Curated annotation (Swiss-Prot):
Coiled coil: none annotated. Interacts with RBMX. Interacts with AKT1 and UBL5. Its main location: nucleus. ATP binds at L33, G34, E35, G36, T37, F38, G39, R40, V41, K57. GO terms for cellular component: nuclear body; nuclear speck; nucleoplasm; nucleus. The modification Phosphoserine is found at S6. GO terms for biological process: negative regulation of gluconeogenesis; protein autophosphorylation; protein phosphorylation; regulation of RNA splicing; response to ionizing radiation. The keyword Transmembrane helix does not apply. Belongs to the protein kinase superfamily. CMGC Ser/Thr protein kinase family. Lammer subfamily. This is Dual specificity protein kinase CLK2. The chain holds residues 137 to 483 of 499 of the full protein.
Length: 347
């Protein structure tokens, strides 16, 4: 899979390595599990612990991503300190080191992302019982971070991995097709390179677009509650199998929000420094442009996404709504979220 795509695709910063290579006379590379902006994640055998398998994030040699990693490490240090028993539901770091100039970090081996599984299943949504379990663990995992003055900032299905993504095959007679279904819905949360402590500096722009919260877009300053926005977007995505906010433009994104959730409140509209997006207390957006038609055509009021009318489904959307409250101050906290009716069945 490590084919050069272009003349611009030199091994720029990329570590030169081949399967079989040994790192620090300990870690033998077996496969490449993924790629990213930061570099690569490979599967390794830990020969110093009886051949257990691990995942090894290997960072490019570029100063931008080196610093991100430094921050990722020290967060994970802080995390293993506050919970040496590793029941938190965030991923577990084991080790970290330099090799040939590139930083490496050693995590427990997990399965595919909730995204990947979903994509590999033709976006066939998760059944509600699994949505509940995944949502629960997601909220637990992040509550933990919030309790310790942390915000993740970049939650999304790519950063929520299954412990074990082994799956049962069930053909559908009722609808004619193949349909997977994961055995164990246990998950863990990964990627702490962007995660931020309350006292540290806050980057102006923070989540992955589709999961980004209005306070961020409007540059009103953010903190713990923007994680919750993202979580709501994720939980929605799990229920219907596609992204709530499929756009790449702030104005359009704000439009979609309005269409889906109702109008943006005025406090936010006066108090933002991004006044280009508004006019006389409303979003400066024409619904009859082709953009305007696209928005109205391809998304709709939140509750029109409900399939069944069973009580448990209504509890889900109660939860989602509360999580997608426009004002961070009023938006549901994860404490409050874990107590919600929807989750009563667990605890
Ligand atoms: C399939 N087994 C597995 N895979 C993993 N990574 C899959 C992957 N990562 C990045 C890009 C593409 N694919 C991991 C990680 C880990 C650590 C850091 C991360 N940082 C940002 C994004 C994801 C990350 C995943 C921990 N345990 C794992 N087990």
């Amino acid at each position: 899979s490590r084919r050069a795509k272009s003349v611009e695709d030199d091994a720029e910063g990329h570590l030169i390595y081949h399967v079989g290579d040994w790192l620090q006379e300990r870690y033998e590379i077996v496969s490449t599990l993924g790629e990213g902006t930061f570099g690569r994640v490979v599967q390794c055998v830990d020969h110093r612990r009886g051949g257990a398998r691990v995942a090894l994030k290997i960072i490019k040699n570029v100063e931008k991503y080196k610093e991100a990693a430094r921050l990722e490490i020290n967060v994970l240090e802080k995390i293993n300190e506050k919970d040496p028993d590793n029941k938190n539901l965030c991923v577990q770091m084991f080790d970290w080191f330099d090799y040939h100039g590139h930083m490496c970090i050693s995590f427990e081996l997990l399965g595919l992302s909730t995204f990947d599984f979903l994509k590999d299943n033709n976006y066939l949504p998760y059944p509600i019982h699994q949505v509940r379990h995944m949502a629960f663990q997601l909220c637990q995992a992040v509550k933990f971070l919030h309790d310790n003055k942390l915000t993740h900032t970049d939650l999304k299905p790519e950063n929520i991995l299954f412990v074990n993504s082994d799956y049962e095959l069930t053909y559908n007679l009722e609808k004619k097709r193949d349909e997977r279904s994961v055995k164990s819905t246990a998950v863990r949360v990964v990627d702490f390179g962007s995660a931020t402590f309350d006292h540290e500096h806050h980057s102006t722009i923070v989540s992955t677009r589709h999961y980004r919260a209005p306070e961020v877009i409007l540059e009103l300053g953010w903190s713990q509650p923007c994680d919750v926005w993202s979580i709501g977007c994720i939980i929605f995505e799990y229920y219907v199998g596609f992204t709530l906010f499929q756009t790449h433009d702030n104005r359009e994104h704000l439009a979609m929000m309005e269409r889906i959730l109702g109008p943006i409140p005025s406090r936010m509209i006066r108090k933002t420094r991004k006044q280009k997006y508004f006019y006389r207390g409303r979003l400066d957006w024409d619904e009859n442009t082709s953009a305007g038609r696209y928005v109205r055509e391809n998304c709709k009021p939140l509750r029109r996404y409900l399939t069944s009318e069973a009580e448990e489904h209504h509890q889900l959307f109660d939860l989602i709504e509360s999580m997608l409250e426009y004002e961070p101050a009023k938006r549901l906290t994860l404490g409050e979220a874990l107590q919600h009716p929807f989750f009563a069945r667990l605890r």
